[PDB]
Design a protein around this ligand. Structure first.
Ligand SMILES: Nc1ncnc2c1ncn2[C@@H]1O[C@H](COP(=O)(O)OP(=O)(O)OP(=O)(O)O)[C@@H](O)[C@H]1O
Ligand SMILES: Nc1ncnc2c1ncn2[C@@H]1O[C@H](COP(=O)(O)OP(=O)(O)OP(=O)(O)O)[C@@H](O)[C@H]1O
Ligand SMILES: [Zn+2]
Ligand SMILES: [Zn+2]
Lengths: 184, 362, 96, 145, 48
């Protein structure tokens, strides 16, 4: 807190910057717990106040029910709230939220198979499609394609995509059959 | 030999990639032609034979020619998609995997959530030697190595990313290698990276647009066994025309609210069915002949189906269909029942649907 | 009307600070200035946390600023809230 | 030309009543409420025609027995024994009907296809009578706004 | 349109002074400045 106050009130001090680079780690550790607000002080000047935020308070604030309460409060203030009553309504909301989070802290005491089946179906069907290409015995077709034939090569080019489409159909059928097995 | 065959293959791939969209629209035009021909299709009488009647006598061959052309164009559209759009999908997937590896440590610090299909499938591509095949950052493995090697074990990271260190060290040192010509079929089959192609095909199979085009092709194939399956291709106008997408977005924008409104309508109609089944059973006779009554609310399921099917579609509600309540001890109760049904179901909820559509427009 | 009210809430929150009410245009002279101001300098969550801390803290252990804010809160005078002013605006010449 | 033809047939003078659109400026606002989204309005009708054609295909393939429109048993008047006749029947009668095609086709009770036909009628009523007409309404109101 | 007209009336009244027409941004350099100006300095009720 001392270092943060000094750095913020002396924003262009290289000597203090050196201390900041000496003390990233402590500042990084204490970053979530360092509260920072600005107030109009007794000297008719805007002053910045540093305080401690507790981990339990932060978790209670971050719980979704409090977030929904905050959203409702903000909606109400923006739509049907004035400027004179704004900071009184905000303080009332803060008090209610603080009491609720304290009560929550007090009361607190100190698909997967369907995805696996889809992955298995993908692996199995794609491996079946890989076996035909990796057979290594394609010498029987280099037999017929020893001489360049536009028609033959176009036919093989289409046949590869037809095989891919058939493999996709098999994968889809397997995914269904697995889903029926899982649900029943 | 292999050079010229690869050149012709590249020419074919480029042709299909260039003409992907033109064949995409030609398929829709052929589908409209086929369905316009089908508008002249008649039943003839014992199994019925669906028959085509025409004065010119020419459209029957036209139907088979158009069906064959549509099937060929669908296959060509699949080829054009695989030539043109698949590289972009693979590039984006490789970019996402690389950035999650580098800046998030998705497979070093944390692990996939065990229910993320693509997150679990992406473990395959990490070990491959053909990683950033499409993505430009070929140094992603070196970057991940520099970031996470010392803390998590450099050998461990090397095994995770598939990089070999002994071969690198020996190639940096005195290394003797003998070139092998690409012309060898065994050489090309050893050079191809099976694991990377496996992962690529997994990504393509999981792609949504490729699945839609495969469904299109399957429907085109089924159209030969039954010509009326070609009507399913008319659902492609949504993707064919951009102006129709605005009209459709006027509905899909609030689709969740639209479904929830139907669920609420079903619940309200079920409550009305409960009330009618408990108090107003006598009024649900739908038989004009007195000998055989046709009571529609003597069973919970039958009464609910009667309500949901007839009263909702009726202009004035369930009272248009159920009998008259005059001269009965429950007359006022049933009048309230009918009026409230008309007001809440026919007027308000349908107005909710209307307002949802108009609000989506606005 | 419900849609318009939601849009108005979003616009107000994205255009002006909740506490001081200064628009984002002034803070955006520094990159990410409005976000930095609304997340670090004038965070309503931080004000709520400060109220919690001041309530829970012993009254004898209060500092001068904490005692000032405590007295103001006990008399329900909200002048300590910055309204139309901020640290960056008060020290605009020195900070910039 | 219409004024000239009015002498040969006096009822051709009714075509000159279409001139109020250009005669009155206030009517131009009401007409612009429609012409502003005219392309979308025509496309909505095209989409309605396509959807009704799909429903006609389904009915012609599975629900032909229910399209008899003759009260006399001697002479059936099947409206869906032909693709064109079934499509015309749908587009002409079911769209104009308040509850859809089920208001006009017979009752499905006591049939093996009862649930399928109930789904058919309910989906027709929801998509055609309710949603698409709502699309037209919303287009007009959005043009106003 | 009626709802939009009401919203416009509210926005104009809350953003600019009725008499001089100066926006609330200028007066808000002092806390509660716009409210003080519109209730004490340029009150239409006071003009009446
Ligand atoms: N005093 C303020 N405190 C916090 N945010 C403010 C303040 N003034 C304006 N804002 C703006 O409000 C927005 C924060 O949104 P909001 O307060 O609704 O919650 P959120 O952080 O988005 O919530 P969630 O965690 O559920 O996403 C930011 O755009 C921020 O700039
Ligand atoms: N010249 C002005 N005189 C008074 N109010 C003004 C003037 N210019 C702007 N305003 C603003 O108009 C608002 C006052 O509202 P309005 O004049 O509609 O009546 P009101 O005081 O709210 O009425 P009611 O007593 O019925 O609640 C305030 O927000 C005020 O800042
Ligand atoms: Zn602020
Ligand atoms: Zn003024």
């Amino acid at each position: 807190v001392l270092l943060t106050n000094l750095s913020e009130h002396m924003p262009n001090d290289t000597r203090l910057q050196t201390f900041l680079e000496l003390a990233e780690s402590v500042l990084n550790y204490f970053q979530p717990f360092l509260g920072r607000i600005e107030i109009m002080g007794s000297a008719k000047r805007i002053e910045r106040v540093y305080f401690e935020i507790s981990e339990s308070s932060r978790t209670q604030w971050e719980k979704p029910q409090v977030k929904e309460s905050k959203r409702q409060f903000i909606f109400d203030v923006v739509n049907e709230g004035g400027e004179k009553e704004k900071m009184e309504l905000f303080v009332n909301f803060c008090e209610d939220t603080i009491f609720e989070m304290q009560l929550a802290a007090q009361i607190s005491e100190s698909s997967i198979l369907t995805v696996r089946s889809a992955l298995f179906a993908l692996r199995y069907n794609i491996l079946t499609l890989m076996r035909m290409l990796s057979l290594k015995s394609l010498k029987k077709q280099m037999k017929k394609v020893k001489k360049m034939t536009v028609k033959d090569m176009v036919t093989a080019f289409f046949s590869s995509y037809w095989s891919i489409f058939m493999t996709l159909l098999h994968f889809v059928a397997s995914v269904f059959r697995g889903f029926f097995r899982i649900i029943c | 030999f292999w050079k010229k065959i690869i050149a012709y293959q590249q020419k074919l791939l480029n042709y299909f990639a260039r003409n992907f969209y033109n064949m995409r629209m030609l398929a829709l035009f052929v589908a409209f032609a086929i369905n316009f021909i089908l508008l002249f299709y008649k039943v003839s009488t014992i199994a019925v034979h669906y028959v085509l009647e025409e004065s010119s006598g020419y459209m029957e061959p036209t139907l088979r020619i158009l069906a064959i052309l549509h099937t060929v164009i669908s296959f060509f559209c699949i080829i054009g998609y695989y030539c043109l759009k698949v590289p972009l999908v693979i590039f984006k997937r490789e970019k996402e995997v690389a950035r999650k590896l580098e800046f998030d440590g998705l497979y070093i610090t944390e692990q996939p959530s065990e229910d993320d299909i693509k997150g679990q499938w992406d473990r395959l591509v990490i070990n491959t030697q053909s990683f950033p095949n499409n993505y430009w950052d070929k140094f992603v493995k070196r970057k991940v190595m520099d970031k996470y090697g010392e803390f998590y074990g450099r050998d461990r990271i090397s095994e995770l990313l598939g990089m070999d260190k002994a071969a690198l060290d020996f190639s940096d040192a005195r290394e003797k290698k003998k070139p092998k010509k690409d012309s060898s079929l065994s050489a090309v089959l050893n050079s191809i990276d099976v694991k990377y192609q496996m992962w690529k095909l997994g990504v393509v199979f999981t792609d949504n647009s490729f699945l839609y085009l495969a469904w299109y092709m399957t429907m085109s194939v089924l159209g030969h066994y039954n010509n009326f399956f070609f009507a399913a291709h008319l659902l492609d106008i949504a993707m064919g025309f951009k102006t129709l997408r605005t009209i459709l977005s006027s509905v899909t924008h609030n689709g969740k609210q639209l479904v929830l409104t139907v669920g609420l309508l079903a619940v309200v109609v079920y409550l009305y069915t409960v009330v009618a089944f408990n108090f107003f059973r006598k009024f649900y006779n739908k038989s004009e002949d007195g000998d055989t009554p046709d009571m529609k609310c003597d069973d919970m399921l039958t009464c609910y189906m009667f309500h949901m099917y007839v009263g909702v579609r009726a202009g004035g509600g369930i009272g248009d269909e159920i009998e008259d309540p005059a001269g009965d001890e429950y007359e006022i109760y049933r009048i309230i029942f009918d009026i409230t049904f008309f007001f809440f179901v026919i007027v308000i909820l349908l107005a909710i649907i209307q307002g949802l559509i108009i609000d989506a427009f606005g | 009307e419900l849609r318009d009210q939601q849009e108005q809430v979003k616009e107000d929150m994205e255009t002006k600070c909740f506490i001081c009410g200064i628009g984002n245009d002034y803070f955006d002279t520094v990159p990410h200035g409005f976000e930095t101001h609304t997340l670090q300098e004038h965070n309503l969550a931080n004000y709520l946390f400060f109220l919690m801390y001041l309530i829970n803290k012993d009254e004898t252990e209060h500092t001068g600023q904490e005692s000032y804010v405590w007295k103001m809160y006990q008399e329900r005078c909200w002048e300590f809230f910055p309204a139309g002013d901020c640290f960056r605006k008060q020290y605009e010449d020195q900070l910039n």
